[PDB]
Amino acid sequence: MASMERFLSVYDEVQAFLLDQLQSKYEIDPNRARYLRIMMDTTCLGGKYFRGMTVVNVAEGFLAVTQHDEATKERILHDACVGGWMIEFLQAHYLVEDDIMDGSVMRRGKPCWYRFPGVTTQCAINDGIILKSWTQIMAWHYFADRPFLKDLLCLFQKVDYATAVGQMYDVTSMCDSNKLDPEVAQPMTTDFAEFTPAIYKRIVKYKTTFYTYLLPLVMGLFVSEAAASVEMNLVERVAHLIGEYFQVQDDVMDCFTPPEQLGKVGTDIEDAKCSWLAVTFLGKANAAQVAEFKANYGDKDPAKVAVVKRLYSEANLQADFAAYEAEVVREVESLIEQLKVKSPTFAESVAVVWEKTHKRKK
Amino acid sequence: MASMERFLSVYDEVQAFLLDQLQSKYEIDPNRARYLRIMMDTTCLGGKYFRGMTVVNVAEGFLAVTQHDEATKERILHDACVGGWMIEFLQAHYLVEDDIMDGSVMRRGKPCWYRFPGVTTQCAINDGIILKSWTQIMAWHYFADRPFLKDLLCLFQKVDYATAVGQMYDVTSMCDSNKLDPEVAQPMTTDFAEFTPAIYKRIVKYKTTFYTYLLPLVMGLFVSEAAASVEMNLVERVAHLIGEYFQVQDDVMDCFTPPEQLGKVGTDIEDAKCSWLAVTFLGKANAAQVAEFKANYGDKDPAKVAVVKRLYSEANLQADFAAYEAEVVREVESLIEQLKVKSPTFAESVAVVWEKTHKRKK
Numbered sequence: 001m002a003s004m005e006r007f008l009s010v011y012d013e014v015q016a017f018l019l020d021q022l023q024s025k026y027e028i029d030p031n032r033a034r035y036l037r038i039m040m041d042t043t044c045l046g047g048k049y050f051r052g053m054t055v056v057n058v059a060e061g062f063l064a065v066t067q068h069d070e071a072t073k074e075r076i077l078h079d080a081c082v083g084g085w086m087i088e089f090l091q092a093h094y095l096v097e098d099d100i101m102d103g104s105v106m107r108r109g110k111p112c113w114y115r116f117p118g119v120t121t122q123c124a125i126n127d128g129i130i131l132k133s134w135t136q137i138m139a140w141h142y143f144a145d146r147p148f149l150k151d152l153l154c155l156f157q158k159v160d161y162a163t164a165v166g167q168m169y170d171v172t173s174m175c176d177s178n179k180l181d182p183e184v185a186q187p188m189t190t191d192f193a194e195f196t197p198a199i200y201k202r203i204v205k206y207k208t209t210f211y212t213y214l215l216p217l218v219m220g221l222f223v224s225e226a227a228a229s230v231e232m233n234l235v236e237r238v239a240h241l242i243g244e245y246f247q248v249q250d251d252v253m254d255c256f257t258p259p260e261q262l263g264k265v266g267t268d269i270e271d272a273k274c275s276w277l278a279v280t281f282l283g284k285a286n287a288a289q290v291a292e293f294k295a296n297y298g299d300k301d302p303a304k305v306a307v308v309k310r311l312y313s314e315a316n317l318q319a320d321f322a323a324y325e326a327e328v329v330r331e332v333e334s335l336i337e338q339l340k341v342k343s344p345t346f347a348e349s350v351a352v353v354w355e356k357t358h359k360r361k362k
Numbered sequence: 363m364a365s366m367e368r369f370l371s372v373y374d375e376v377q378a379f380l381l382d383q384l385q386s387k388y389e390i391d392p393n394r395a396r397y398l399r400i401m402m403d404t405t406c407l408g409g410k411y412f413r414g415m416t417v418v419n420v421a422e423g424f425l426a427v428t429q430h431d432e433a434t435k436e437r438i439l440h441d442a443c444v445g446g447w448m449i450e451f452l453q454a455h456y457l458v459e460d461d462i463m464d465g466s467v468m469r470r471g472k473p474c475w476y477r478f479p480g481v482t483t484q485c486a487i488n489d490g491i492i493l494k495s496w497t498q499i500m501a502w503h504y505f506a507d508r509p510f511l512k513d514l515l516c517l518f519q520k521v522d523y524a525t526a527v528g529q530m531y532d533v534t535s536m537c538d539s540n541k542l543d544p545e546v547a548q549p550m551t552t553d554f555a556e557f558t559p560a561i562y563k564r565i566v567k568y569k570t571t572f573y574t575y576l577l578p579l580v581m582g583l584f585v586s587e588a589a590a591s592v593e594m595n596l597v598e599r600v601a602h603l604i605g606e607y608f609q610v611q612d613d614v615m616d617c618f619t620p621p622e623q624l625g626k627v628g629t630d631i632e633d634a635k636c637s638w639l640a641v642t643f644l645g646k647a648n649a650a651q652v653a654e655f656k657a658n659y660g661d662k663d664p665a666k667v668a669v670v671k672r673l674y675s676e677a678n679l680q681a682d683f684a685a686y687e688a689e690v691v692r693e694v695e696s697l698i699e700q701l702k703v704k705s706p707t708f709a710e711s712v713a714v715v716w717e718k719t720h721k722r723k724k
């Protein structure tokens with residue numbers, strides 16, 4: 001896509017600025033500058049750029065209906081690309097740390113960053129921290145004199161905190177809340193009582209929906225100066241809805257999508273994750289099915305994982321996803337219609353975003 | 363100390379606000395709220411609070427010479443305490459991740475956070491990320507309407523980036539720059555050619571001096587509105603000088619100070635760290651001494667570590683530290699005199715800070 005390649009050309013500008021700054025202000029050597037360049041490329045590139053291209057899309061919509069000088073149009077489009085890369089870099093930060101915590105093997109067709117022989121977990125923790133730090137370097141440099149700077153930084157902080165809190169919920173989802181204790185080693189749940197739709201929704205809300213949909217949509221509004229033209233409560237509600245759906249897709253693919261086309265290998269069953277599939281399974285399974293689930297879930301053994309996948313296949317969870325998808329379509333369609341009242345162009349942006357999310361196969 | 367207990371009372375206010383916010387806005391359960399409370403206490407408390415009490419000290423100095431209403435004095439002191447805890451929380455973030463990267467056992471008399479049975483490395487990475495995130499939650503809430511907010515957030519970002527870049531230099535200091543490659547596993551240096559005073563100074567500058575001394579001193583200036591009353595170039599120069607000295611102390615204690623009084627166990631020799639002792643050793647050792655160093659450094663073997671410690675003891679590095687200390691005293695004394703020209707009260711603050719740093723035994 002031509003639009004996506006212009007977005008990538010801004011990445012090259014950002015990379016050039018960040019690496020020249022390390023050279024000029026941080027006394028870096030060429031070899032460590034090379035390392036961070038490879039680090040930036042491996043962690044930030046290779047994806048679909050859904051979050052980044054959302055910011056551009058929202059801004060392009062308002063540009064079509066609002067009067068600007070040609071140079072102002074160039075300013076806003078460049079702002080949208082920079083703001084888009086802030087989110088892609090923020091995602092990169094979370095992806096790097098997430099892979100370590102989940103013990104993942106590959107990220108978009110390549111080994112996870114920490115799996116690289118010359119990286120290891122030791123370097124990867126700090127590399128992830130650097131990635132988040134770059135987002136702030138970007139904002140202060142590029143959006144220095146911009147009126148949206150204060151609001152952008154404030155939202156970015158809240159969204160980032162929400163994700164970190166969300167990851168906390170996710171990484172401790174396979175153990176009982178009442179047994180949580182830093183002093184005593186955490187045993188895996190036996191009753192799976194916290195594997196409920198309500199608890200699943202809490203985890204997903206904070207761990208993905210804030211940075212995956214809320215941030216890109218409001219970012220595009222900030223760079224367009226069009227936050228007043230929308231009802232924010234609707235933006236929150238529609239972002240959390242498509243965001244949840246996005247993670248449900250992710251949960252299904254973790255189990256049923258082959259790694260060659262997915263770009264990752266699944267670990268949810270092995271990690272005993274509170275995924276959509278496990279929650280939906282326990283929401284329809286009979287007594288014996290539950291007992292077989294309890295005897296095989298949360299183990300690295302290929303034979304035990306195979307039993308869990310078999311249980312999912314026999315429990316017809318494909319019909320449950322279709323029923324869930326049909327409901328999401330209803331509610332997203334409803335919210336897009338509500339968004340048309342004050343901003344039809346933003347409602348169209350959400351419609352495009354939803355279409356891409358709904359149709360995705362990776 | 364009475365002053366230190368009033369500083370700790372603000373921590374309780376901050377902890378109450380952060381935990382009530384998780385309850386009211388982030389849908390947290392009491393058990394996970396308890397976990398993060400223990401996490402906050404274990405990672406932020408138990409230290410000397412040098413960085414935190416520096417902010418208070420700088421502010422107290424200006425309060426003694428400037429006219430304010432009684433309520434304004436209460437405002438500034440509370441600001442100084444909150445700004446002080448932002449740094450203590452920022453240090454906590456770096457301490458949590460640093461211990462994982464260095465494979466450390468104890469932090470201030472207690473097991474490192476990741477060593478806790480109910481924590482592990484998996485949870486600790488995110489806990490550290492949460493700690494940094496809390497610093498921004500603090501700033502936006504407490505310093506919302508303050509005129510120094512923009513400058514505080516901008517400096518905090520630069521200081522944080524500098525530290526992360528510094529940790530990168532530190533964690534890769536035992537391998538050759540020209541051999542750095544994410545694709546190929548990193549072998550330890552054989553010539554130790556990058557163990558120079560100049561390279562040591564670069565690492566220390568970025569990994570500690572920015573957040574340990576620069577940030578607390580300027581933070582106290584921001585809350586006092588007294589940044590104009592100082593020459594910033596002097597503040598930079600004096601903070602990087604005492605900061606370097608502070609890390610040299612840390613390097614010496616890692617080897618020669620017993621864990622019972624230090625609160626940590628040393629790992630520098632085992633990790634093959636570019637510490638002051640190793641650099642100073644290679645700067646005076648004869649051919650045979652170097653060869654024995656090369657055959658024993660960077661190994662977990664107690665016998666090999668013992669040989670390295672013996673080499674340090676025989677090379678009389680105590681006389682080298684005394685010679686280094688005497689030079690630092692000269693240059694710190696010089697800079698404090700230069701600070702008296704525009705702000706004598708800030709110069710006194712630095713003198714107190716230096717006295718505490720110079721006299722410290724842990």
Ligand SMILES: O=P(O)(O)C(O)(Cn1ccnc1)P(=O)(O)O
Pocket residue numbers: 094095098099102104167170207208250254
């Ligand atoms: O399933 P996860 O949440 O770990 C994941 O979606 C990443 N992630 C982490 C937080 N939100 C999303 P991925 O499967 O991509 O590893």
Ligand SMILES: O=P(O)(O)C(O)(Cn1ccnc1)P(=O)(O)O
Pocket residue numbers: 456457460461464466529532569570612616
């Ligand atoms: O020696 P390090 O740099 O690892 C240390 O001083 C922590 N640190 C990390 C960066 N700056 C300081 P500590 O010995 O306290 O573990």
Ligand SMILES: C=C(C)CCOP(=O)(O)OP(=O)(O)O
Pocket residue numbers: 046047048049050091108208212246247250362
């Ligand atoms: C489910 C989440 C939020 C993590 C994966 O997100 P993406 O599917 O956007 O990953 P990339 O395309 O960026 O690799």
Ligand SMILES: C=C(C)CCOP(=O)(O)OP(=O)(O)O
Pocket residue numbers: 408409410411412453470570574608609612724
């Ligand atoms: C050398 C550095 C910068 C890490 C230790 O700092 P401190 O000696 O201040 O650690 P605490 O007292 O805060 O535990």
Ligand SMILES: [Mg+2]
Pocket residue numbers: 098099102104
């Ligand atoms: Mg994962």
Ligand SMILES: [Mg+2]
Pocket residue numbers: 098102170
């Ligand atoms: Mg995960």
Ligand SMILES: [Mg+2]
Pocket residue numbers: 250251254
């Ligand atoms: Mg997943």
Ligand SMILES: [Mg+2]
Pocket residue numbers: 460461464466
């Ligand atoms: Mg350490």
Ligand SMILES: [Mg+2]
Pocket residue numbers: 460464532
């Ligand atoms: Mg260290």
Ligand SMILES: [Mg+2]
Pocket residue numbers: 612613616
């Ligand atoms: Mg040390």
